[PDB]
């Protein structure tokens, strides 16, 4: 596969570009709706790992507006975007 009769292949006649980032492999992305899986009102890296929404080897996580929530959630140690923070405050939770 990838051999096209002798002429320079597509994957070799185009240039290499980019470098890999290590911190991206440890950063975690979390949906707002996924917080419903967390037992209790505390949102943290430990509680997320306990709920199995973040892998045990990640060091930091972020929450993005993707779905909806109904319970109040006090968020600690997790990065919150503008929409996610607005949704949490509307639901009645607090940050830090």
């Amino acid at each position: 596969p990838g051999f096209e009769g002798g002429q320079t292949a597509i994957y070799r006649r185009l240039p290499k570009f980019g470098f890999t980032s290590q911190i991206a492999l440890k950063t975690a992305e979390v949906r707002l709706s996924e917080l419903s899986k967390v037992e209790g009102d505390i949102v943290s890296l430990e509680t997320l790992k306990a709920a199995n929404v973040v892998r045990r080897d990640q060091i930091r996580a972020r929450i993005v507006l993707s779905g909806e929530i109904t319970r109040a959630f006090t968020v600690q140690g997790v990065a919150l975007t503008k929409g996610a923070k607005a949704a949490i405050e509307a639901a009645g939770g607090k940050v830090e």
Binding site: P1, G2, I10, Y11, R12, L14, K16, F17, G18
Partner: protein, 63 residues
């Protein structure tokens, strides 16, 4: 066994929502004679062609 990636093609292709993005060639060393519009337009990233997406998928089973 487990399928193996073609690392050379992985280093040239990257994953998007509905396809693959690449850069453009003809911009490494010989550049003085090239015109300004050529220099600008060949800059940036474009999309992989449909006739080549199948080969790219075969070469990159996971990304």
């Amino acid at each position: 066994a487990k399928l193996k990636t073609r690392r050379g093609a992985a280093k040239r292709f990257k994953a998007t929502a509905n396809g693959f993005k690449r850069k453009q060639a003809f911009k490494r060393h010989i550049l003085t004679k090239k015109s300004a519009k050529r220099i600008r337009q060949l800059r940036g990233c474009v999309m992989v062609h449909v006739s080549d997406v199948a080969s790219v998928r075969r070469m990159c089973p996971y990304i």
